[PDB]
Amino acid sequence: RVASGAGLPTSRQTTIMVTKYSEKSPITIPFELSAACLTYLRETFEGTI
Amino acid sequence: ANKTLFKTIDEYLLRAKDCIRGDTDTQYVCVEGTEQLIENPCRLTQEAL
């Protein structure tokens, strides 16, 4: 605020209050495997090379 | 306004300034203090450009 000279209206106090909010934006990516991959990952048939 | 030179330029600095209200679409004269006076050098030279 700035003090006023003669003849000019003096300025009053003010209090200004504002609010802000967040936002959301999820992301997704898939990956897929074949049943043969899942079989051969666990199972070792007869152990050959 | 036809005083001596230095009194003339002092009167130009103080008195010879108009004011126009800047809120409105049409030009209205303002009263002292509400908004600052406008320098107009044409008033000293007494010419239009």
Secondary structure string (H, E, C) spanning chain A = CCCCCCCCCCCCCCCCCCCCCCCCCCCCCCCCCCHHHHHHHHCCCCCCC
Nearest CA-CA distance, residue B14 and chain A, Å: 16
Nearest CA-CA distance, residue B35 and chain A, Å: 9
Local structure of residue B15 (DSSP, 8 states): T
Residues of chain A with Cβ-Cβ distance to B37 below 8 Å are none
Residues of chain A with Cβ-Cβ distance to B32 below 8 Å are 7
Entry resolution (Å): 3.3
For residue B22, which of B9, B10, B12, B37 has the smallest C-alpha distance? Answer: B37
Structure-determination approach? cryo-EM
Residues in chain A, overall count: 49
